[PDB]
């Protein structure tokens, strides 16, 4: 303040869960707790299972698009192999029908 004394205006509550994986992500960067997520236990930064925080630094995304780019082609090639096993299923049924 202008008299150069500071007063605490609150503390940012962090929250953890039983599992992180049960979190049903809503329509934003938001997640939401569920029955599958476990009810959230609440606290502050640095107490037990909780998160050491930072001030001005912002958390980037965790995607590594090298692994994403190498996973899209393996999903792509086994997609095409699934297309070819229904293709040869079509061919064996085609020669199954018209054999007379």
């Amino acid at each position: 303040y202008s008299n150069e004394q500071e007063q605490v205006l609150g503390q940012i509550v962090l929250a953890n869960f039983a599992n992180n994986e049960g979190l049903a992500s809503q329509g934003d960067n938001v997640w939401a707790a569920t029955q599958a997520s476990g009810v959230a236990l609440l606290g502050t930064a640095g107490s037990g299972n909780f998160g050491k925080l930072t001030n001005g630094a912002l958390e980037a995304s965790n995607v590594d698009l090298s692994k994403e780019l190498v996973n899209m082609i393996v999903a792509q090639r086994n997609y095409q192999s699934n297309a070819q096993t229904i293709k040869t299923q079509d061919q064996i049924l085609n020669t199954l029908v018209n054999l007379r």
Partner: protein, 251 residues
């Protein structure tokens, strides 16, 4: 006649996944699981989550079964029957210090402390001050100061004082005495069943203090090289690991 559809059990390529709870073997073993029906099944998938009850399940919620962690220290039991293992937020309770040991290296060139009788407020009454932080039956901190006073050739009075106890008196009667051989090796007096102070409704710790592996230096400083104990604070939980040979440990 189709003779039957056989599996092949060579291990697939193990793939480095940066997730923590993703343990997968590469041999002929089999993970053991159970569902809520009560029937035991066997798998090899590495996707291991934990429920809202925090027991380790697969992706289909089938609980992993493992050997339990029974005792204090928690170990295996002599019935040998696996069970659904959990990762609780139940806090690690503290237990009183029972074995604490302090190793000391004291110079033999040190003169006898001048200002006699002993005082904890007089640095010239002892030769060496040391600190060991023990924990009692409930488990709060006790900064046991131990005190080393050269009486004569190769003989060292050893005094104990709980600085954490405001209701305790100063040590004036002898706790123990390190008596060394000619060679500088400890002969006797290297153990004491010493009792701490009583603080805030927590009863005192009564622990075996040991001075084994201590040796009398010839020229140097009075030096504590190694303190160890089995007392601690209530830790709630921080993290956990699946160790490399199968067991799960909790930080």
């Amino acid at each position: 006649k189709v003779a039957g559809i056989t599996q092949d059990f060579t291990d697939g390529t193990t793939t480095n996944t940066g997730r923590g709870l993703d343990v997968a073997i590469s041999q002929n073993g089999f993970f053991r699981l159970v569902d809520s029906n009560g029937s035991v099944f066997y798998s090899r998938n590495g996707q291991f989550k934990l429920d809202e009850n925090r027991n380790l399940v697969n992706m289909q919620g089938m609980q992993l079964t493992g050997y339990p962690a029974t005792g204090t220290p928690p170990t295996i039991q002599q019935g040998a029957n696996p069970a659904p293992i959990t990762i609780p937020n139940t806090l690690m309770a503290a237990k009183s210090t029972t074995t604490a040991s302090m190793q000391i290296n004291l110079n033999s060139t040190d003169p006898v402390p001048s200002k006699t009788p002993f005082s904890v407020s007089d640095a010239d009454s002892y030769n060496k001050k040391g600190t060991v932080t023990v924990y009692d039956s409930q488990g709060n901190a006790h900064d046991m100061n131990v005190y080393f006073v050269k009486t004569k050739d190769n003989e060292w009075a050893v005094y104990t004082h709980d600085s954490s106890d405001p209701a305790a008196t100063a040590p004036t009667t002898a706790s123990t005495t390190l008596k060394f051989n000619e060679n500088g090796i400890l002969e006797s007096g290297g153990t004491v069943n010493i009792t701490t102070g009583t603080i805030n409704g927590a009863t005192a710790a009564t622990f075996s203090l040991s001075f084994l592996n201590s040796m009398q230096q010839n020229t140097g400083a009075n030096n504590i090289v190694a303190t160890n104990q089995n007392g601690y604070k209530p830790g709630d939980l921080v993290s956990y690991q699946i160790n490399n040979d199968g067991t799960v440990v909790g930080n």
